[PDB]
């Protein structure tokens with residue numbers, strides 16, 4: 001039932017244009033023959049630029065899972081601590097204040113987990129509570145925020161942090177010129193984000209200025225395991241992405257949104273600010289359509305998609321910060337809407353201050 | 354909050370340690386390490402383990418892609434078996450579950466096991482999911498702690514923890530190094546589940562098992578190298594450092610004194626010790642650092658011999674053993690696990 005005190009985004013310094021990425025990409029080994037479909041997919045992606053953890057031309061040398069995942073660990077901890085620290089300072093808080101840290105990634109395999117490494121780097125208390133969320137994927141931005149409330153609900157004086165870090169480009173060893181993988185090369189970029197939330201009694205104490213987290217609802221769809229996820233192997237984390245995904249949103253999302261807003265005696269028109277995960281144009285349109293939304297409602301997520309691509313779990317937290325910068329009217333409601341491997345959906349009710 | 358059911362599940366393929374060792378030395382390329390292996394396997398004080406696969410199939414499990422696929426299918430089966438068995442113990446149903454947390458470190462699944470388990474068992478579509486990956490051997494205890502944290506903010510709810518560890522399935526990664534060989538002497542397969550309910554739900558549901566009073570985590574400084582995964586083309590390769598036991602002997606007493614002082618308790622106030630069986634040298638160091646009678650640790654020594662090291666799942670099998678022996682009402686119990694971090698987790702229980 002708590003309150004956000006800090007949101008912060010972090011990106012790798014290497015920034016490229018989509019056209020720059022596409023032009024060099026079609027010149028990679030194995031790939032020139034597929035230039036036509038690559039150019040089409042990358043144009044259709046509605047992404048104009050992406051940040052990457054490695055120099056663009058380093059990727060043809062990134063063939064080994066072991067190398068990729070080791071670079072993942074090094075670079076993910078970096079970005080994660082940069083994201084967290086930015087969030088702490090936005091929240092006028094500091095590492096020793098954190099009672100619990102959550103960590104969301106679907107894009108590398110880290111044991112000891114990321115939270116353990118970030119905790120060691122930023123000097124959080126040895127008794128900090130660790131929640132390593134792996135395999136929630138694109139939904140983990142909303143889901144991590146929900147889990148933070150679930151913690152702070154039972155701890156009103158407490159501070160809890162979520163750090164999302166997604167380095168999609170490092171899954172390159174698993175990438176080959178098949179359609180689904182290539183779709184991936186069109187949308188996904190790298191980035192990280194951190195949310196610092198505080199308990200209700202701690203909220204007055206630290207002048208927590210962000211939105212109130214009022215409630216959440218998970219929604220898991222039957223017989224939809226195959227829709228999204230990885231097919232993990234020796235060449236690494238290989239994307240699975242069915243075309244059927246968009247259809248599932250169109251038939252069931254309106255239902256899940258209306259069933260949830262009802263329980264608060266609100267309807268979707270009472271929502272003053274939408275914060276939706278930017279999966280891709282067809283997806284964003286789908287949630288626009290099925291929810292009968294004006295095109296202004298999802299503008300920030302279209303723009304985030306455009307500027308930095310799809311960041312998996314971190315995207316919705318970037319778009320969340322963008323809307324916090326926008327300063328919606330006080331007392332008005334907001335709704336986080338994320339979806340990913342499951343197939344599932346996550347709704348988080350917000351109240352703007 | 355308060356535990357309502359604890360249930361372990363194992364593969365039906367069970368083999369004596371000697372069955373295993375004999376077969377193992379004849380595997381591809383480990384004929385010239387017969388001596389070191391036989392020494393390692395005999396000194397593990399494991400007498401048998403459950404394998405999720407036929408013992409003869411392992412020589413063919415050379416591909417990480419193969420092994421992980423088999424992981425996913427076998428792990429949802431075992432996990433479902435444990436939840437069902439803990440649900441039955443609680444006399445509760447799949448529809449009662451408000452939050453499922455899953456712990457594994459032996460396979461990589463997206464979507465996660467909780468996704469797949471919820472599907473197979475028909476949990477509510479609005480069930481809260483908390484897949485935990487990379488806690489390793491601490492997750493059996495740290496999982497119970499996460500449940501108590503959830504149920505403290507939701508005292509009317511039901512939260513479960515399913516721990517599934519299929520360690521044998523990491524065979525693609527093992528080679529004749531001391532580290533990997535030690536792991537092939539120690540680790541077994543199996544699963545376990547815990548059902549727990551909020552305080553306001555405890556009466557209405559007649560929750561049998563122990564209250565969950567508190568927990569403390571302890572993340573040691575500059576200790577990444579102690580335990581973890583070397584991830585690569587061949588899958589998940591064991592990273593296990595000699596300095597582990599000396600870490601315990603140096604810092605374990607501090608961790609537990611610090612925790613118990615916050616409740617003004619002494620080591621003698623603890624009626625039941627529920628510790629992870631990380632092998633003989635680890636169990637010795639727990640006893641030694643905490644000056645415990647050979648009595649106090651016997652239930653985990655027993656688990657180690659019968660079933661082997663099940664990663665996060667072992668401590669829950671032992672929690673079921675301690676419960677079924679019924680400690681005296683109102684007496685205190687301490688779960689004590691350790692995993693990659695390096696970290697340590699303590700959970701304080703009160704019994705019935």
Ligand SMILES: CC(C)(COP(=O)(O)OP(=O)(O)OC[C@H]1O[C@@H](n2cnc3c(N)ncnc32)[C@H](O)[C@@H]1OP(=O)(O)O)[C@@H](O)C(=O)NCCC(=O)NCCS
Nearest residue numbers: 041044045138179180183241242243279280281282283339
């Ligand atoms: C990737 C994307 C930007 C490109 O779309 P686009 O160029 O208009 O192309 P279309 O979707 O109209 O589909 C046309 C073709 O691409 C194929 N295609 C699109 N997405 C595909 C996928 N995920 N897997 C396999 N094929 C796919 C179609 O099957 C079709 O092939 P065909 O002409 O031979 O029949 C768009 O499909 C999209 O937004 N996908 C959603 C991404 C997603 O699922 N994100 C999940 C995060 S929640």
Ligand SMILES: CCCCCCCCCCCCCCCC(=O)O
Nearest residue numbers: 025137138168169184185188239312
């Ligand atoms: C050509 C250089 C850049 C390549 C950039 C994209 C590399 C990765 C492609 C697959 C991305 C998958 C992201 C999946 C997130 C999820 O499953 O939730």
Ligand SMILES: CCCCCCCCCCCCCCCC(=O)O
Nearest residue numbers: 458489490520521536537540591664
């Ligand atoms: C004939 C083979 C029998 C089975 C041999 C299985 C050997 C498994 C070795 C690796 C176990 C790894 C457990 C790691 C737990 C953790 O991450 O803390």
